[PDB]
């Protein structure tokens, strides 16, 4: 027999997903006296690299260097490959510095161990190196470096790959047009996904799931759902990468109707056991205000993972449910599933919430010495929003200087909210300038300065911060409230008159102000962000778009029923006064979700116990 006989076999089983049975036969020759040559190593190799097995690799390694193949681009490519898929981008990185000749395959492995293992900047750089020695990349090439700039979310770089890869001819290439779907969305340039995405001449579930995934991670949710809905049409059949992204457009919708939808589509396609599938259904669930059917989900789910659990802990935190989310981050344990920083941001998020002040404060002073997990600047985050809600300022700015991390406007912008709350203007007045310095186009820290200073009666200076808003060309964004009713979302902005039930909106708004009225509710202009008489003030205030959804809802659903609104920005404080008494008035719950918290208001009382 030859090492050509064995090579046919090695290259059949190592081909045919059956790595072992590749090394197997490779031992086999070891003891029969054949001797490898050049093309039985890549294989072998190749087998090692699809178990992650070093070991194995380390020794055929060594027969390399014995068999006089250290010179090989094929046998070296494959060390490189066998080295980058098992972890160690060091020895990949020491065999291709190594090497006496290298090839495009030689790059890309380099090239793309660094990309998939996060090393985005290296990734990049070896791309910039291998082009000035004129090494012409090929279509993996491009798929490489154009992942790892949506990792780093330069859409410069990734502008000129994308010339670079018209250059090449390559931008029929179906793996090149997703790749570049992939990187201009998570780059930000979404329309230019779009361009892409119209203009593939073959696209698969994978071109569809990566354009939908890119509209509902830009928060664009309408747009993702119609492209699920032509996606449909055209008889490309969703699979269980496409439904999550689907499920999470749903989450930022809040259309609780349309989720079910999905939910029963998710049903007759089988994927419902799938495990992402079943964790963004809880996401989806709770997003829409459905803590019992998110539980229903998790409760029936044949395989719990640790982000089911995640999921589930995370659904009761942001509805303020701390002791249930504590009570599951304890069962989890007993189940024996190890919590992870993820379920951590989650136990200290529901801590916050719901106002457990020890327990948070044990729950991550405990992370580093009883678990592996070294606190992040997230958990740091949330231990000053629970110190804000405590009333311990001090100690919360101070944790923002004593913090191992450098601060960001989340931080900043928890302790300004916080101050808000309790009255500290010059706290106030200090995390505001943090937050300009920070991000100095953000409207929010101004809008919370103006309402420091005129809660304080400054309203001059509250005068000048709104003026410089003005000045520096700073807009916030309008509000905006949603409320799905009869299985369609209405959309309303502040003292809307474009839907076609105004007439009946308004003339229920009026009738329920008598009832405020006489409840005790007053009007509280305060805040009411425009230069104008009192009066018109009053008039503006009573149709913030939170109360014409509230009043739409009202007279479309029969009473008793609740009531889920979604609010893009934030409920203002007269409108959370407002919806306390209207909750009584009408007996009804109402759940309004708004950037930052979930408020249930029920019989005159809200459960985020009046801090948000
Ligand atoms: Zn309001
Ligand atoms: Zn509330």
């Given at each position: 027999n030859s090492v050509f006989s064995w090579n046919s076999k090695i290259r059949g089983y190592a081909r045919n997903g059956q790595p072992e049975e590749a090394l197997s036969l490779y031992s086999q020759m070891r003891?029969?006296?054949?001797?490898?040559?050049?093309?039985?190593?890549?294989?072998?190799?190749?087998?090692?690299?699809?178990?992650?097995?070093?070991?194995?690799?380390?020794?055929?390694?060594?027969?390399?260097?014995?068999?006089?193949?250290?010179?090989?681009?094929?046998?070296?490519?494959?060390?490189?490959?066998?080295?980058?898929?098992?972890?160690?981008?060091?020895?990949?990185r020491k065999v291709f510095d190594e090497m006496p000749e290298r090839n495009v395959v030689s790059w890309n492995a380099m090239i793309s161990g660094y990309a998939q293992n996060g090393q985005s900047e290296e990734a990049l750089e070896l791309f910039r190196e291998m082009q000035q020695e004129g090494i012409k990349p090929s279509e993996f090439t491009?798929?490489?470096?154009?992942?790892?700039?949506?990792?780093?979310?330069?859409?410069?770089?990734?502008?000129?790959?994308?010339?670079?890869?018209?250059?090449?001819?390559?931008?029929?290439?179906?793996?090149?047009?997703?790749?570049?779907?992939?990187?201009?969305?998570?780059?930000?340039?979404?329309?230019?996904?779009?361009?892409?995405?119209?203009?593939?001449?073959?696209?698969?579930?994978?071109?569809?799931?990566?354009?939908?995934?890119?509209?509902?991670?830009?928060?664009?949710?309408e747009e993702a759902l119609e492209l699920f809905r032509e996606m449909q049409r055209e008889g490309v059949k969703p699979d269980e990468v496409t439904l999550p992204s689907v499920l999470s457009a749903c989450a930022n919708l809040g259309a609780l109707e349309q989720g079910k939808q999905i939910?029963?589509?998710?049903?007759?396609?089988?994927?419902?056991?799938?495990?992402?599938?079943?964790?963004?259904?809880?996401?989806?669930?709770?997003?829409?205000?459905?803590?019992?059917?998110?539980?229903?989900?998790?409760?029936?789910?044949?395989?719990?993972?640790?982000?089911?659990?995640?999921?589930?802990?995370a659904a009761y935190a942001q509805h303020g449910h701390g002791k249930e989310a504590l009570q599951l981050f304890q069962q989890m344990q007993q189940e024996g599933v190890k919590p992870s920083e993820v379920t951590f941001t989650s136990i200290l998020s529901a801590c916050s919430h719901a106002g457990l002040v020890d327990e948070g404060h044990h729950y991550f002073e405990s992370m580093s010495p009883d678990y592996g997990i070294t606190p992040r600047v997230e958990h740091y985050g949330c231990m000053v929003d629970l110190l804000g809600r405590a009333g311990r300022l001090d100690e919360a700015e101070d944790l923002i200087k004593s913090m191992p991390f450098q601060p960001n406007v989340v931080v900043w912008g928890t302790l300004l909210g916080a101050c808000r709350v309790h009255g500290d203007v010059e706290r106030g007045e200090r995390a505001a300038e943090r937050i300009l310095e920070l991000?100095?186009?953000?409207?929010?820290?101004?809008?919370?300065?103006?309402?420091?200073?005129?809660?304080?009666?400054?309203?001059?200076?509250?005068?000048?911060?709104?003026?410089?808003?003005?000045?520096?060309?700073?807009?916030?964004?309008?509000?905006?409230?949603?409320?799905?009713?009869?299985?369609?979302?209405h959309e309303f902005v502040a003292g809307d008159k474009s839907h076609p039930q105004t007439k009946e909106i308004y003339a229920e708004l009026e009738r329920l102000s008598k009832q405020m009225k006489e409840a005790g509710y007053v009007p509280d202009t305060k805040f009411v962000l425009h230069d104008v008489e009192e009066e018109e003030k009053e008039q503006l205030l009573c149709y913030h778009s939170e109360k014409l959804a509230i009043a739409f809802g009202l007279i479309s659903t029969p009473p008793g029923t609740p009531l889920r609104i979604i609010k893009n920005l934030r409920v203002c404080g007269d409108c959370h006064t407002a919806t306390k008494f209207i909750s009584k008035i009408v007996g009804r719950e109402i759940v309004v979700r708004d950037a930052n918290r979930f408020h249930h208001f029920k019989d005159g009382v809200c459960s985020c116990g009046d801090y948000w």
């Open positions: 003891r029969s006296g054949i001797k490898p040559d050049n093309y039985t190593f890549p294989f072998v190799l190749k087998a090692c690299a699809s178990l992650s097995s070093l070991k194995e690799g380390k020794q055929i390694h060594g027969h390399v260097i014995k068999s006089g193949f250290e010179s090989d681009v094929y046998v070296q490519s494959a060390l490189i490959d066998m080295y980058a898929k098992c972890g160690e981008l060091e020895d990949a491009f798929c490489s470096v154009l992942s790892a700039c949506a990792s780093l979310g330069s859409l410069e770089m990734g502008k000129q790959i994308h010339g670079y890869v018209i250059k090449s001819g390559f931008e029929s290439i179906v793996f090149v047009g997703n790749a570049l779907i992939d990187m201009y969305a998570k780059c930000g340039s979404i329309e230019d996904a779009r361009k892409v995405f119209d203009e593939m001449p073959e696209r698969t579930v994978v071109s569809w799931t990566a354009m939908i995934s890119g509209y509902a991670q830009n928060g664009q949710s939910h029963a589509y998710v049903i007759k396609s089988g994927f419902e056991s799938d495990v992402f599938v079943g964790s963004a259904l809880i996401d989806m669930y709770a997003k829409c205000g459905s803590i019992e059917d998110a539980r229903k989900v998790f409760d029936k789910m044949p395989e719990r993972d640790v982000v089911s659990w995640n999921a589930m802990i991000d100095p186009e953000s409207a929010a820290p101004y809008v919370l300065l103006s309402n420091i200073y005129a809660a304080a009666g400054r309203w001059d200076e509250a005068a000048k911060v709104r003026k410089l808003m003005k000045e520096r060309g700073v807009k916030k964004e309008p509000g905006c409230s949603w409320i799905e009713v009869n299985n369609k979302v």
